[PDB]
Design an enzyme around this catalytic site. Structure first.
Site, PDB file in Angstrom:
ATOM      1  N   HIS A   1       0.833  -1.193   0.000  1.00  0.00           N
ATOM      2  CA  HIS A   1       0.000   0.000   0.000  1.00  0.00           C
ATOM      3  C   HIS A   1       0.870   1.246   0.000  1.00  0.00           C
ATOM      4  CE1 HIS A   1      -0.430   1.438   4.451  1.00  0.00           C
ATOM      5  NE2 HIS A   1       0.671   0.711   4.350  1.00  0.00           N
TER       6      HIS A   1
ATOM      7  N   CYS B   1       3.720   5.574   5.555  1.00  0.00           N
ATOM      8  CA  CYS B   1       3.730   4.385   6.388  1.00  0.00           C
ATOM      9  C   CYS B   1       5.157   3.877   6.527  1.00  0.00           C
ATOM     10  CB  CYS B   1       2.857   3.290   5.765  1.00  0.00           C
ATOM     11  SG  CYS B   1       2.744   1.776   6.702  1.00  0.00           S
TER      12      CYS B   1
ATOM     13  N   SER C   1      -6.209   5.805   9.429  1.00  0.00           N
ATOM     14  CA  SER C   1      -4.826   6.206   9.190  1.00  0.00           C
ATOM     15  C   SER C   1      -4.700   7.269   8.115  1.00  0.00           C
ATOM     16  CB  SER C   1      -3.952   5.003   8.792  1.00  0.00           C
ATOM     17  OG  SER C   1      -4.223   3.867   9.589  1.00  0.00           O
TER      18      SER C   1
ATOM     19  N   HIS D   1      -5.409   5.355   1.342  1.00  0.00           N
ATOM     20  CA  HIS D   1      -4.521   4.309   0.845  1.00  0.00           C
ATOM     21  C   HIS D   1      -4.764   4.059  -0.635  1.00  0.00           C
ATOM     22  CE1 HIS D   1      -3.945   2.783   5.118  1.00  0.00           C
ATOM     23  NE2 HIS D   1      -5.100   3.429   5.222  1.00  0.00           N
TER      24      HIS D   1
END
Ligand SMILES: Cc1noc(C)c1CO
Length: 147
Positions: free
Chosen positions: A43, A97, A138, A141
């Protein structure tokens, strides 16, 4: 009529039919044809100021808006789909990330371990297929199913 989560849609600029998946947010021109215990995905995450932790290896304090993060995501999708850039290259350079250092790879996982919009998109993707923008706590993505 079609695999899980697909619907017909009409292009507003060409009037030609296309297909949209409401679980992965993928869209494509060709008719889709067609679950395992585990899937493997990579991702590219773009965080925004309302992310659960608005920080990453790229930026100590992440201040971009959700709208700005979606615009970045949309631009990465364009370059991946045109073949100007590889998904992995963009994830390594720009994903917010820790998995950026592994070309975005998250390894394999089961249902129950990832945040739900991410899990559902991952399991609805076919092998090799890429998601559209997927929203979680988060951030936003782009997901690539590898296995
Ligand atoms: C392609 C690609 N994706 O991540 C890295 C690092 C490369 C090599 O430039």
């Amino acid at each position: 009529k079609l695999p899980p989560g697909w619907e017909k849609a009409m292009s507003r600029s060409s009037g030609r039919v296309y297909y949209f998946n409401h679980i992965t947010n993928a869209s494509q021109w060709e008719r889709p044809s067609g679950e395992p215990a585990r899937v493997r995905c990579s991702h590219l995450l773009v965080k925004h100021s309302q992310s659960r932790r608005p920080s990453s290896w790229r930026q100590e304090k992440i201040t971009r808006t959700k709208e700005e993060a979606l615009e970045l995501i949309n631009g990465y999708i364009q370059k991946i789909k045109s073949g100007e850039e590889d998904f992995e290259s963009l994830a390594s350079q720009f994903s917010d990330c820790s998995s950026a250092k592994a070309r975005g790879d998250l390894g394999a996982f089961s249902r129950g371990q990832m945040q739900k919009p991410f899990e559902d998109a991952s399991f609805a993707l076919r092998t090799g297929e890429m998601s559209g923008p997927v929203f979680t706590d988060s951030g936003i993505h782009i997901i690539l199913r590898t296995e």
